[PDB]
Ligand binder design. Structure first.
Ligand SMILES: [Cl-]
Ligand SMILES: [Cl-]
Ligand SMILES: [Cl-]
Ligand SMILES: [Cl-]
Ligand SMILES: [Cl-]
Ligand SMILES: [Cl-]
Lengths: 250, 243
């Protein structure tokens, strides 16, 4: 049942032995990833939107329909990217999370940026959305993993990534943990020293994104990361293969 | 314009090469890669969506149509309809969805058996009339399963004879193209294209022969079934295994 899937998913967040997730975008891709030995599935908002011909411009109901097809395609635990939570106010984000649970997801990514400007929400406004999500999950009686994404590093040029940004990231992480987040996702962060400092101080299991060849999975694990994401890389590789067939006359 | 463009691309010896797409994202990728038209394939769409009801295919189809300015043809399998009247309705739905052609197959969908020639032709006629009634330039690619269903060892001049007699009945009914999946023999493909009343579509099995070699056989259209989807999923599986 979904609580057992939720428990399995939670248990896989292990500092130094990280959960690696590949984002799927439909039931076919879900099945392929599960058959290739994945231990859980994630959706990615970018991949799902691209697959469906969009640039939270995809309506929530259409995302939920996609999610249900993904969930029923395999027996693996599925986490869903809900972006900023498809809601103006905290109560609206709670409805979104509650709908994700009804759709059969056992966790989410919930991000702290405004879809209008891409700017960060105030720490406590962001935390209030997390708290509403936690409450919705708690009312459902489900074991549900809220992975709180912070865009502190993601929105900053790499050359500006330093201790001040790490400190801002950690202040958000503490607020988000207190509000009921289960994990912290910090995309855009690649510095070994900063990742080490983050995992040493974070109140929550840390998710980082792999983009370049470096750092590698083994390196990230050694820094103490608990979860590794790849964004739309899987979808983009699949589509590269498709485009090359077309050009090669294959 | 889309329909007339698509029709014009069926040139014997200068064939249209079609890749079957299965969602709006794949449609865009293929278009950006230089394709001049797009096809939907039923197997790929079903696979991507976890299989299929007519409504889901039409929903998928509309999203693929809106995704690019290319002409789009849709695989309608046997036509999603018990009687010719029902096939006409499926065609009408596809036109509302923005498709400018279809593949329509002459076999019973639950068994794979061929319909008698007059019943298969009547379904083509109903499709043609539905398109004519809608006032659209719509390309009906009549798929015959003669080589698809029959044992390889019966694949001879007699099976070609059967294929050609069906093609002529289908042409008289309003078909615009003839698709003969399961036909691989170069001698039979050459014989078929020389005698066919309609531009011929063959389906590539392997990467050999080249698009150039097939063109030299006089074919007008070359398709690839679910191969593009399967290759994309191969890459996805490999990525996961590499970690
Ligand atoms: Cl993604
Ligand atoms: Cl960095
Ligand atoms: Cl991700
Ligand atoms: Cl297909
Ligand atoms: Cl043959
Ligand atoms: Cl095909």
């Amino acid at each position: 049942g979904n609580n057992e899937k939720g428990a399995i998913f939670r248990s896989l967040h292990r500092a130094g032995q990280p959960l690696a997730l590949f984002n799927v975008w439909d039931a076919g891709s879900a099945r392929v990833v599960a058959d290739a030995g994945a231990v859980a599935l994630a959706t990615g908002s970018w991949s799902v939107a691209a697959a469906n011909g969009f640039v939270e411009q995809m309506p929530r109901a259409l995302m939920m329909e996609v999610l249900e097809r993904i969930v029923r395609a395999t027996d693996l635990p599925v986490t869903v990217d809900l972006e900023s939570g498809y809601g103006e106010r905290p109560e609206d984000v709670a409805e979104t999370i509650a709908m994700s649970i009804r759709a059969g997801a056992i966790g989410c990514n919930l991000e702290d940026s405004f879809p209008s400007t891409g700017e960060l929400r105030d720490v406590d406004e962001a935390a209030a959305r997390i708290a509403a999500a936690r409450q919705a999950a708690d009312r459902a009686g489900v074991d549900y993993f809220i992975n709180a994404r912070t865009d502190v590093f993601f929105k900053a040029a790499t050359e500006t990534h330093d201790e001040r940004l790490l400190d801002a990231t950690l202040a958000r992480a503490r607020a988000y943990a207190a509000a009921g987040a289960d994990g912290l996702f910090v995309p855009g962060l690649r510095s070994p020293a900063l990742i080490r400092a983050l995992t040493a101080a974070s109140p929550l299991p840390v998710n980082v994104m792999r983009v370049a060849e470096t750092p590698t999975l083994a390196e990230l694990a050694e820094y103490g990361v608990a979860r590794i994401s790849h964004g739309p890389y899987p979808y983009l590789q699949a589509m590269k293969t498709l485009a090359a067939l077309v050009k090669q006359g294959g």
